[PDB]
Design a protein around this ligand. Structure first.
Ligand SMILES: [Ca+2]
Length: 172
């Protein structure tokens, strides 16, 4: 009853010279892909803003809709500095009563338009991973979306594990 094994970090690019002070602010989740959820027809992933606040200790406070982003419930957690700039540990992506935490690698960004971010369970026995496509706006180019499908598939994901939330539903 297990998941598609997570890729090694060797297959995941890291944004070089990551600028933490340009990555802060509001990002929309334009695309989500992962091994741990299915493209539900009658309960779709909602588009939600994610807020990054940069702290003086170079952590971020991050505010986001709880995964898997089907209920209009938000949480705040912390991105703690990882091995390099642009890589972090995140404590939680939802209510997690088990021994669970997340490695976060900013794969690519241009700060003012798009980002792609990789997440994988830290725990040795866990295979959970996902990728988010961030937009400063609710819409991104065909080119940016196709590149997200490309990256997502490169990590073993089939098409039914890749979703683009409708840039609508402010969770009324
Ligand atoms: Ca946790």
């Amino acid at each position: 009853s297990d998941l598609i094994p997570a890729p090694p970090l060797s297959k995941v690019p890291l944004q070089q010279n990551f600028q933490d002070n340009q990555f802060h602010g509001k990002w929309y989740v334009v695309g989500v892909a992962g091994n741990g959820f299915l493209r539900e027809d009658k309960d779709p992933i909602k588009m939600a803003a994610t807020i990054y606040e940069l702290k003086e200790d170079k952590s971020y406070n991050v505010t986001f809709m709880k995964f898997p982003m089907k209920k209009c419930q938000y949480m705040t957690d912390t991105l703690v500095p990882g091995s390099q700039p642009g890589e972090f540990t995140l404590g939680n992506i939802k209510s997690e009563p088990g021994y669970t935490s997340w490695l976060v690698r900013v794969v690519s960004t241009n700060y003012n338009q798009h980002a792609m971010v990789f997440f994988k369970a830290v725990q040795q026995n866990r295979e959970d991973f996902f990728i988010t496509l961030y937009g400063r706006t609710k819409e991104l180019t065909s080119e940016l979306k196709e590149n997200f499908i490309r990256f997502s598939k490169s990590l073993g994901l089939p098409e039914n594990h890749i979703v683009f939330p409708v840039p609508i539903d402010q969770c009324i």
